[PDB]
């Protein structure tokens, strides 16, 4: 009886196995744009993905992950609110059953159709597993998706999804350039939070871009053909794999922009 996104094992149940679910710095949150304050001290944000080396794409039963070779300093996030260098390890998405829902963060209570999470770990902790035990261990770059024009740089991901339909399937996925998933502007909001899935560790500096990317209805419809189940098990479509907004508690959301 494992955690998931069903009626019986969804986000409102997670606190029984993961009591930190009711903690002081849980994610995602609603971003109240009028209450976020411009912080002129944030340093410029630096996304350096030219040398990123993708390895594989995996259906883990909760989302699909594009994983990167993080054995050297190639693809790094620095600057913004961050002290030091954070290395890209994987990206994944959260999405809805309908275009009106799917994002984890919300903006003035608006839900986007999906949200991209580019996950990075702080190199001062040596490995990912050590980093997630630290309050500044991870930096996750979050990018909203809206439905409209296709995102050409997403299509290579869309086209491999038929080969990883069910939980536990993986496929080779080399030479994918995650710069093709970024919007034009790097304006962002930032706050201290958590993983949005169990174990819900409070180790993340969240950096949420203000500008959504546009993807086509056909691209997101292909996300919604994935399965939560394993092969040979009753089919359950992988949709609504998002945690709703959590209490902000004693936190301030900072804006990089006026
Ligand atoms: N929704 S979110 O952005 O808040 C979020 C939620 C969970 C994770 N975890 C992650 O990307 N994992 C978990 C992990 O232990 N390893 C173990 C080490 C290892 C090694 C290679 C590739 C991936 C991994 C994964 C990475 C991160 C972010
Ligand atoms: Zn995520």
Author numbering: 3 to 125, 127 to 261
Paper text:
CAs are a superfamily of ubiquitous zinc metalloenzymes, present in all kingdoms of life, and encoded by at least eight distinct, evolutionarily unrelated gene families (designated α, β, γ, δ, ζ, η, θ and ι) converging in the same crucial reaction, the reverse hydration of CO2 to H+ and HCO3−15–18. CAs were shown to be essential for the worms to establish a robust infection in experimental animals and findings strongly suggests that chemical inhibition of CA from S. mansoni (SmCA) debilitate the worms and curtail the infection. Here, we report on the development of SmCA inhibitors conjugated to the PZQ scaffold as a possible novel therapeutic target for schistosomiasis. All compounds were evaluated for their inhibition profiles on both humans and Schistosoma CAs, X-ray crystal data of SmCA and hCA II in adduct with some inhibitors were obtained allowing the understanding of the main structural factors responsible of activity.
The last derivative taken into account was compound 34a since we aimed to evaluate how the ethylene linker in the ureido moiety could affects the location inside the active site of hCA II. The sulphonamide group showed all the classical connections mentioned above as the hydrogen bond with Thr199 and the hydrophobic interactions with residues of Leu198 and Val121. In addition, as for complex 35c/hCA II, we observed a water bridge among Thr200 and the nitrogen atom of sulphonamide group. On the other hand, for the inhibitor tail we observed interactions similar to the 34c/hCAII complex, such as the hydrogen bond with Gln92 (in both the alternative conformations introduced for the side chain) and a hydrophobic connection with Ile91. Removing the ethylene linker for compound 34a also did not change its arrangement in the catalytic pocket, proving that the key part of these derivatives is the pyrazino isoquinolinone scaffold that stabilise the complexes in a hydrophobic task, explaining, thus, their similar potency against the hCA II isoform.
